[PDB]
């Protein structure tokens, strides 16, 4: 064969938890110090009507840092903006939900850096 390549397990596969976090977490960057990060809803079929509640939170912090703080933010909607962030900066943003009076698992990570402040990079 080859000399290995492209092996290495991502997220432990067949999830037995009784939740199911969100899938295709992107994150966009708007501005140096803005970042909006959306996603997809998976639990949530094209159609569906549940009387049970949910709440999605979106925790982020320095990529490659040693002393970094983990954020998180409350928010109803597929999509949250980062602002107040540092230019020319990138780092890990991920999306749950609260169901059941409690928490779920993370979904799969976003990586997305900020423009240099001080005037965004051109072509």
């Known amino acids: 064969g080859s000399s290995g ?4 397990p991502t997220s432990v596969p067949d999830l037995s938890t009784p939740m ?3 899938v295709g977490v992107q994150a966009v960057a708007l501005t140096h110090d ?3 990060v959306s996603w997809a809803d998976n639990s949530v079929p094209k159609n569906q009507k549940t009387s049970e509640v949910r709440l999605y939170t979106v925790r982020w912090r320095t990529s490659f840092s040693a002393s970094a703080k983990y954020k998180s933010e409350d928010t109803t909607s597929l999509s949250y903006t980062a602002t ?7 780092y890990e943003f991920s999306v749950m939900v609260t169901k059941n009076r409690r928490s779920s698992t993370w ?3 976003a990586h997305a850096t900020t423009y240099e402040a001080s005037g965004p990079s051109s072509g």
């Open 84 to 90: 107040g962030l540092k230019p020319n900066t990138m």
């Open 107 to 109: 979904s799969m990570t």
């Open 34 to 36: 803005a970042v909006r």
């Open 20 to 22: 199911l976090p969100p």
């Open 5 to 8: 390549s492209s092996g290495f």
